[PDB]
Design a protein around this ligand. Structure first.
Ligand code: STF
Length: 101
């Protein structure tokens, strides 16, 4: 598949270990259980990591796929298990919604 570079649109995004101190990011998935909703979201950067300081992701980015795993819309229990081991770069797929405020 193709890949861009940087733009404020729904796409593949990739986040290198620029300063090696882990990624330092924050995500939340949902499921089709207790509420009807499903999905994944970048809740924040963690204000202290390599993918935080040089990836500078936005609060609210609706995540869909994960490094080594093209999920296209499935919950973190089969994806954050891969992302945590990354050691060098997360590829991701996201869609800009919400803001900091
Ligand atoms: O903050 C973190 N950096 C890591 S390395 S593991 C931990 C949890 C975490 C993993 C991946 C993501 C990401 F890449 F944003 F999906 C968020 C949080």
């Amino acid at each position: 598949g193709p890949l861009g570079s940087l733009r404020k649109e729904p796409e593949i995004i990739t986040v290198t270990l620029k300063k090696q101190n882990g990624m330092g990011l924050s995500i939340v998935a949902a499921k089709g259980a207790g509420q009807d909703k499903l999905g994944i979201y970048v809740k924040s950067v963690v204000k202290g990591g390599a993918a935080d300081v040089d990836g500078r992701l936005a609060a609210g980015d609706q995540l869909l796929s994960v490094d080594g795993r093209s999920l296209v819309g499935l919950s973190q229990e089969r994806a954050a298990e891969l992302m945590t081991r990354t050691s060098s770069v997360v590829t991701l797929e996201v869609a800009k919604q919400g803001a900091i405020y």
